[PDB]
């Protein structure tokens, strides 16, 4: 369920940070931005469950 | 609770990534990576099972 889905997303997010190049692309950083925001929104929604 | 608070913290991190501009310093990328990893540790603990 939702816990495990958010734990996997969080792991994916942390690894994308860890795997960044020294000079990351604009697009990579947009993707990271979006993945942080998504996870924050999903946590808040589940909080209001 | 913790879900709400962790949610807000991911949104905060999203802003930090959003603010990055071309060639972010290594210190900044490492700072943001460590914040992700710290939030990751919290989520792992919260989602166990």
Numbering used by the authors:
A (entry chain C), B (entry chain D): 1 to 49
Paper passage:
Finally, we demonstrate the function of an exemplar pair in regulating transcription in both E. coli and mammalian cells.
We attempted to crystallize all four selected pairs and were successful with 26α/26β. In contrast, near-complete quenching occurred when 26β-c4CF and 26α-nMSE were mixed, demonstrating the proximity of the 4CF and MSE residues. These data are consistent with 26α/26β forming a heterodimer with a syn topology in solution as observed in the experimental X-ray crystal structure. In summary to this section, the in vitro solution-phase biophysical data confirm that the cognate pairs selected from the in vivo BiFC assay, i.e., 9α/9β, 14α/14β, 21α/21β, and 26α/26β,all form stable, helical heterodimers consistent with the targeted 4HB structures. At the lowest concentration of peptides that gave measurable CD spectra (i.e., 1 μM total peptide), second derivatives of melting curves returned melting temperatures of 43 °C for 26α, 30 °C for 26β, and 48 °C for the mixture 26α/26β.
